[PDB]
Amino acid sequence: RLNEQNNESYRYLRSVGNQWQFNRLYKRFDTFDLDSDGKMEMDEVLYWPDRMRQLVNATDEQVEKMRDAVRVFFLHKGVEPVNGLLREDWVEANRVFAEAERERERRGEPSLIALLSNSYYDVLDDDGDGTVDVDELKTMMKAFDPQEAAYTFFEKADTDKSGKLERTELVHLFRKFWME
């Protein structure tokens, strides 16, 4: 069972008075239980920024900003600080987070997906031109475990055909991906 006591998204919804109730997906979980112990843990998810950090390019501040966004993001996705997130609570945790994000949009509050995206944006672009290119996106894939395949994400996200992903466009990429 998931509720305001063991899940941050229910904590968020009830803090603002939203009474929402929960009544492929698992493959994503299995990609994220690195040790396959069927629990996702904060040390485990915090591995992903550690990999990204080794592949670039980036300042301590930029890396820490990303580390923090990843931590906030997975916490709200249900990964509790010490207790983690069991495979059996994964599906719910996902849907409650989707509601929390819709509620944040309704209240004009910052998307946690957007926070995560913007944090990665500053780490993915570190020739410091100030935009992300398709080679830079390749690095993102390799960090989240396949480089060619970023050509697919990329074409979908550069709706101006500029040849570079700009902040807005990356937010759209991450955003669409969790929900569709």
Residue closer to Mg ion (CB basis): 56 or 100: 56
Q: For Cα atoms 108, 109, 115, give the angle at the middle one, nearest 5 degrees.
A: 130
Asked if residues 143 and 56 have their Cβ atoms less than 8 Å apart, the reply is: no
Based on the shown chain and the rule CB under 5 A, indicate whether residue 160 belongs to the binding site for Mg ion: yes
Any known ligand binding at 65? no
Any known ligand binding at 33? yes
Based on the shown chain and the rule CB under 5 A, indicate whether residue 155 belongs to the binding site for Mg ion: no
Asked if residues 66 and 60 have their Cβ atoms less than 8 Å apart, the reply is: no
Any known ligand binding at 127? yes
- The rounded distance, in Å, linking the Cα atoms of 118 and 96 is 23
Residue closer to Mg ion (CB basis): 68 or 166: 166
> Which of 30, 129, 135, 155 touches Mg ion (CB under 5 A)?
129
Closest of 70, 71, 77 to residue 8, by C-alpha:
77
Based on the shown chain and the rule CB under 5 A, indicate whether residue 50 belongs to the binding site for Mg ion: no
Instruction: Supply the minimum distance, in Å, between the C-beta of residue 36 and Mg ion.
Output: 7
Any known ligand binding at 129? yes
In Å, how far are 6, 56, 69, 90, 155 from 125, measured between CA atoms? 36, 9, 17, 32, 18
- Residue 173 gets the label, from left (phi > 0), alpha (psi -120 to 50) or beta, of alpha
Binding site for Ca(2+): which residues? Answer: 33, 35, 37, 39, 44, 125, 127, 129, 131, 136, 158, 160, 162, 164, 166, 169
Tell me which residues touch Mg ion (CB under 5 A): 33, 35, 37, 39, 125, 127, 129, 158, 160, 162, 166
